[PDB]
Structures are given as structure tokens and as C-alpha cells.
Amino acid sequence: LYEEDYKLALEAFKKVFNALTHYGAKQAFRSRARDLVEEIYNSGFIPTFFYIISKAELNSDSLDSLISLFSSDNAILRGSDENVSYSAYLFIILYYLIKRGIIEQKFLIQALRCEKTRLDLIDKLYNLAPIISAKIRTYLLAIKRLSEALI
């Protein structure tokens, strides 16, 4: 069932290893990798998601310094402490969510463009949290093992 997720990680990730440079918030990503996973199933998906969006800088910088990844190239994501190194992770999860038709782009792109629809974007993620948590599990453990090996 899950055998293209390992293929999806390459062109979803696209860079959370190299252009995450300076080795602080670069190596720190592995803490995301392990902890969040144990966080995502011991504590739930929505608690971890609220935590991740908390660390998001959702102005337009951490709203477009990521939606630029949909289109162009590797995005050196220096910015500041893990808020741009954290909005790439929000991007990771939402990239899985769009490339697997759990939530479509036309909503996502529209949900992150008014701040009126961020709320019901999250309110809809809340209803999809069981299914989402079940489905991303292997797709996440993929990048967790990527981190163990490479990052």
C-alpha cells in the first residue's frame, strides 16, 4: 500500500538537509524526526500540529518562503531559529496532504491566504487527524530514518 511514499519523500523534502545549513536547526531537524513521531502517536496528531504551527512565523514569510517550494527549487531556509526551519516541516506535512488527496490544493492554497480560512483549515485537519496520522506514519518514519542515516 505504502511503497511510493519513499518516492514521495524525495520530491516533497526537496531540501531539509543541505540548504538547512549551519548545523543548528539543521541537525536539530532530527529532534523533529524522532520526538514528533513519538509525539504524534502517543499524544495525538492535533497536539503536535498545534505545537508545530505555534512555532510557525505565518506572516507571509512563513507563508510564501514555503509555497515557493511548490514551484521552483531548493529554498535555503536560514531565516531565524526553528520557525523557517519549522515552516518547512509544516510544508512537509501539508505536501503529503496535497500529494495524497487528503486535502486538495485549491483549499489549502486558499486556506493559507485569508487568515479567515486558516481556522477551518485546522478545524478540518482536526477531523482528518485519525486518517492522517495512520497514513503519514510510514512517510514520516521515512524521513526519521533519513535523519538517522544522513541528517
Binding site: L1, I131, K135
Partner: protein, 283 residues
Amino acid sequence: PYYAFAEPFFIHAITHLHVGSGSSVEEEIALPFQRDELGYPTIYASSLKGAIKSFLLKEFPDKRDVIYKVLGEDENPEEASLGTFLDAILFAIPSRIIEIDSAKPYVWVYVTTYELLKKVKLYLDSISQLSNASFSNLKNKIDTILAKEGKNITLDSDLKSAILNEDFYVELEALNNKIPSIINAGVPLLVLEDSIGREVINRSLIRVRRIRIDRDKKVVETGGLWSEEYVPMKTIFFSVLLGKESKESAIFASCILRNLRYVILGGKETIGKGIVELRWVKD
């Protein structure tokens, strides 16, 4: 005459089971289960008959001659046994369910594929209108279910959706409105598409590593590590006992088979891996 009457029965696992096969597969397990042609867990008729015969010889030592006649003789085995077991085929395996819907709480569910039910119907059609014991309702139920092959069907439920074995989302649909349950354990049955059903099933099996520890310095001995595969508790198999007409076959069916609930199948019994409850389809 010549397999006049038959007894189909359910093999309900009371503990885990491990009917072994050597290292007879290409998986990472080193002590796999006995496998069907479809890679599903099966119980060969040799093993089932040997275990049941041994158990009956122990717990009916005066009926040793009747048991010898029905199931064979150690020496002077120039007298064909007038009873036979078919291979036990997996009928349903318990699965962990994270259900999203139905307002009804369930934490585990029975799971089947349509291949399994196809073989069960094969066993079942080859008896009823041929032999004389009549339990056509079970066959009608299995045919009604087999009608819907190619889509995850829930049975006796209102689920409509679930996570199975913590790893697989599936979208279900009731059969028509309602149907008598094929099992009597009040737990939903799900019949799954033969492709996602087998992923769910091969994730329902228990594959453990095991270790031999150095008895003095409490460490593992070198190479004292292997893997084994148990069919989970509550798993159900299905088999039939076919009886050729004779007198002591009636004694078998009357005195003996009516006092067989629990037997020990398979091996690794000191681990406790063999207890089984036999439910005859006669209630």
C-alpha cells in the same frame, strides 16, 4: 457410503498458535507458520489429524480401538482410516481497529478476504447438496457476501470507515441491510478486497524475535537469536471431518466428537502456543 456424512468445524484459537513448517518461506521469519498456496496461514490436515488423534488417545484411553479405526493404526497400518480432515483454512483473523464512525466502540475486528471466503465456500458447496447434513444457511450467507467481491465490505455493522491494524485506512459498506452473523462472537466481520485484506492480515500475525541467554552471565549466546510467527489468539480456521459409513464412526461422532471443545495443535506448547477450541457447525 464412501464419505456419507461430514462435520465442518471452526478452529478458534484460545492462545496463539504455531503450527511449524521448518524454514519453508522466503520471509524474514526463521520459524514461519504453515502456509497456504496464497501465502495465508494454514493448518495441514496431517498436523490437525495427528494432534487430534494424540489428544483423543490420551483423554479416551479406553476408546483406543474406535480412535484407531477412525484415524489409523500405528502398526498393522493395513487398514485405511475411515475418517479424514481437510486442510484447515483461515476463515477470519482479528485485527486492531481504529474506527472513525458508527458511534459504537470497537477496538478489534474480524477480518477476511474474498479468497479465503472462496475456499470456504468451496469446502462448503462440496458437502451440503452432496452429503445429507443440512446447514445451507451458512452457504447462503457466504454466497451473499461473495456477491460483492472487489470492495471492502463490512458485515453486521454501521462502521463505514476505520483504520485497520494501525496502518490502513479503509472505507466500508454494509451488505444489504442486515444478515445473521457467520460467527457467534459478537464482533463485526469485515471482508476486504483481496489486496488490502492480505496486508491487514499479514500485519495481524505475530512475528516475535526470541533469544537464548547465557545461563550464567545473563547475556545472549552468539547466534542465539531467531524469529517465530504465531497466528494470533482469537483467530478462526475452518476444516471438515469426513466420515466413511461404519459403526465405530457413529461411536466417534457420538461419544467422542460431542466432548471435544479444547485440544492442543501445533508446537511450542511450553510457551503455551497450542490451545484451540473446536466449534462444530451443528449448533
